[PDB]
């Protein structure tokens, strides 16, 4: 749980840093990360650690 959480968040951060990912809508990114088993908590953390505007309009909670 703990180790898999750390790894998910870290993978999400590198994901958000990908130049091809960055130019896509926030919605795409959230939905993909959710399909990757991240919690909304972890999604929010990833955006923070990646220094990217946490997408405020959060539909999928
Ligand atoms: C091929 C480039 N790319 C996308 O275009 C893209 C853009 C928005 C949403 C999903 C995708 S699929 C995709 C995935 C990835 N990376 C992974 O699938 C690896 C990964 C990322 C986050 C995780 F939580 C687990 C594995 C990189 C670029 C990329």
Geometric angle at alpha carbon 38, from 36 and 31, rounded to 5°: 60
45 close to 15: Cβ distance less than 8 angstroms: no
Task: Tell me the two tokens of residue 27.
Answer: 């919605």
Residue 2 Cα to ligand 1 midpoint, Å, equals 22
Task: Tell me the technique behind this structure.
Answer: X-ray
Q: Which atom of ligand 1 is nearest to the CA of 21?
A: 7
The resolution in Å comes to: 2.2
Task: Tell me the two tokens of residue 1.
Answer: 């749980």
Sequence-distant (≥ 6) Cβ neighbours of residue 47 within 8 angstroms: 16, 53, 54, 55
Which of 15, 30, 31, 34 most suits a substitution to test ligand 1, by most atoms within 8 Å of the C-beta? 15
Q: Which atom of ligand 1 is nearest to the CA of 33?
A: 24
Encode 1-28: b = buried (16+ Cβ within 10 Å), e = exposed. eeeeeeebbeebbebbeeeeeeeeeeee
9 close to 42: Cβ distance less than 8 angstroms: yes
């Amino acid at each position: 749980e703990e180790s898999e959480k750390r790894k998910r968040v870290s993978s999400a951060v590198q994901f958000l840093h990908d130049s091809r990912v960055k130019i896509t809508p926030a919605a795409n990114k959230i939905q993909f990360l959710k399909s990757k088993g991240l919690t909304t908590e972890e999604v929010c953390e990833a955006f923070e650690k990646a220094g990217q505007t946490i997408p405020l309009d959060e539909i999928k909670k």
